[PDB]
Amino acid sequence: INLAYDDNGTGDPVVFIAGRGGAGRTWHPHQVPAFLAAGYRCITFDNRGIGATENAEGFTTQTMVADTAALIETLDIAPARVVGVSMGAFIAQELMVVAPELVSSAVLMATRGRLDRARQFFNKAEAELYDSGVQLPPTYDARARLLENFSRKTLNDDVAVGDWIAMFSMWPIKSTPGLRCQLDCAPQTNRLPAYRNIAAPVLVIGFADDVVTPPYLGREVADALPNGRYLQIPDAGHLGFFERPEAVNTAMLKFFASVKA
Amino acid sequence: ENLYFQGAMDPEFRVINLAYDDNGTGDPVVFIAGRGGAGRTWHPHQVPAFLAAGYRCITFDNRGIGATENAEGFTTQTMVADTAALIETLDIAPARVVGVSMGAFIAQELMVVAPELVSSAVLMATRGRLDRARQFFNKAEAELYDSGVQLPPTYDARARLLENFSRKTLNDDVAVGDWIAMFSMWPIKSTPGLRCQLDCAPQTNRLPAYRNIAAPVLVIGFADDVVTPPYLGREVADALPNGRYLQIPDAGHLGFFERPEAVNTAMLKFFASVK
Numbered sequence A: 001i002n003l004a005y006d007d008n009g010t011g012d013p014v015v016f017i018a019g020r021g022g023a024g025r026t027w028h029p030h031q032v033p034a035f036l037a038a039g040y041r042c043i044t045f046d047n048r049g050i051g052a053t054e055n056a057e058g059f060t061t062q063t064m065v066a067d068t069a070a071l072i073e074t075l076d077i078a079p080a081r082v083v084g085v086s087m088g089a090f091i092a093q094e095l096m097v098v099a100p101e102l103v104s105s106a107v108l109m110a111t112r113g114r115l116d117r118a119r120q121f122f123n124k125a126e127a128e129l130y131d132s133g134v135q136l137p138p139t140y141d142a143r144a145r146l147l148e149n150f151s152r153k154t155l156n157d158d159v160a161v162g163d164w165i166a167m168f169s170m171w172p173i174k175s176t177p178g179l180r181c182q183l184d185c186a187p188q189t190n191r192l193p194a195y196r197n198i199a200a201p202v203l204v205i206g207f208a209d210d211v212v213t214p215p216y217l218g219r220e221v222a223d224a225l226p227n228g229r230y231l232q233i234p235d236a237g238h239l240g241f242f243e244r245p246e247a248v249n250t251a252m253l254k255f256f257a258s259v260k261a
Numbered sequence B: 001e002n003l004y005f006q007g008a009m010d011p012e013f014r015v016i017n018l019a020y021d022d023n024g025t026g027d028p029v030v031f032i033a034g035r036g037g038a039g040r041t042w043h044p045h046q047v048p049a050f051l052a053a054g055y056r057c058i059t060f061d062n063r064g065i066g067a068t069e070n071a072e073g074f075t076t077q078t079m080v081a082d083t084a085a086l087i088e089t090l091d092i093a094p095a096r097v098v099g100v101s102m103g104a105f106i107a108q109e110l111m112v113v114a115p116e117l118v119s120s121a122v123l124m125a126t127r128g129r130l131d132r133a134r135q136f137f138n139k140a141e142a143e144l145y146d147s148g149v150q151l152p153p154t155y156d157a158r159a160r161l162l163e164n165f166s167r168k169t170l171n172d173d174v175a176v177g178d179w180i181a182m183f184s185m186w187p188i189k190s191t192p193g194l195r196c197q198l199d200c201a202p203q204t205n206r207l208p209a210y211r212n213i214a215a216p217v218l219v220i221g222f223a224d225d226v227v228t229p230p231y232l233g234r235e236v237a238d239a240l241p242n243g244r245y246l247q248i249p250d251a252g253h254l255g256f257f258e259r260p261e262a263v264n265t266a267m268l269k270f271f272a273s274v275k
């Protein structure tokens, strides 16, 4: 299948890969304008399992890597810069393994390279939640999103919390066969040994208060990557890029301006 | 032994008995557990240290816990009155008090209305108002109960883990294994009692009222606590004329269980100087 995508600007191409449950649209409130102002061309799209393909099941990481590859080819932008978060970082990482020629450099946020215990606990809890058929009431659900995703600093802030709660109604996350299948697109094995063969410059960004994918797992990906280096953002939850856009964009942009297209 | 004391009359005009424990012969300390917690939660890390320091330790089952787990229709004033009744029954006024969370809130309210019952207090993981996020967590928790919907067991255990512990504990896999096995030995039963304990929280800002409390008080905030953030506790110490604040690094909501030695040392140091 070809997937919905969204092409802006002219210049060195950057492809954004969202996390589980996220659409291309996730990149537009805070990332795309800042990249455009810096002269890049931005591509965002809907991962398989999202939007038009939310009933897609039986797909794997590998299917998702080929989707991304196909997109990079179909637009004739190889090699592109690649920005990915979480599942998206994991898809970026694996694309660079099978198709290094498609990617010039990458930013990977909130990522990991093996099946660590935090990931297992989360895999079990989430899978269980889906198979039970249970519907969390909205306010309890909004509470879990709040604690899962934001820094302590943010939660202490009355105006922000009102926003983030409001903002949840504009970003409904429907439980779908696609969303369940994306649960499986995560490392199953140690991938760090495979990562030691990636040539491309890579920046790994860890968010300090991240509990879904804690920072130290990003240091590990940065260490396995010959040209990798790790950066940490203080006071950012798992949605660090939405919560601290300026600090996050400045870092991706200083990094991307330092490497060749 | 099986000791009982008579609780306050509730707003439905019933009078129940509550269980308590009494150990030692020394200077009396009354421990008040948080929401969901039986008196026995102070036994592993607090009571031995206080007995070895010559304190007598009173623990008890708050209303809505253990034998009264089906109690409903009570309020913060009912629990404050219950605590006072325990104090008056042992004839130990004015007593040292230690409260955590809901129990710290009960101690704060007890000092507002019955200051002569309490000589000094340690308040852990506390607040004297609910902020936006905490207000919302309270409402979310109420909604869950009221809806009937049971959380699957693994989801439940993960949530419990993340809400209660520090990042330091959370990053250490052996430690996480230990606590999740422990969860099975401290199961939190969902009960009309527990649901009712959810409303013994500030509904209004109580910090003004705390301005008249004269007793020496030590407020302890846990740095990684997200169920009651340290800043709310520090607002409480700022309010109290003789309150002082201390923060325990690397402690989640359950700091007094996770960093018992740092907590204990600070409380025993505080109690040796008071008045």
Ligand code: NA
Pocket (backbone or CB within 6 Å): B237, B238, B239, B240, B241, B242, B243, B244
């Ligand atoms: Na003060």
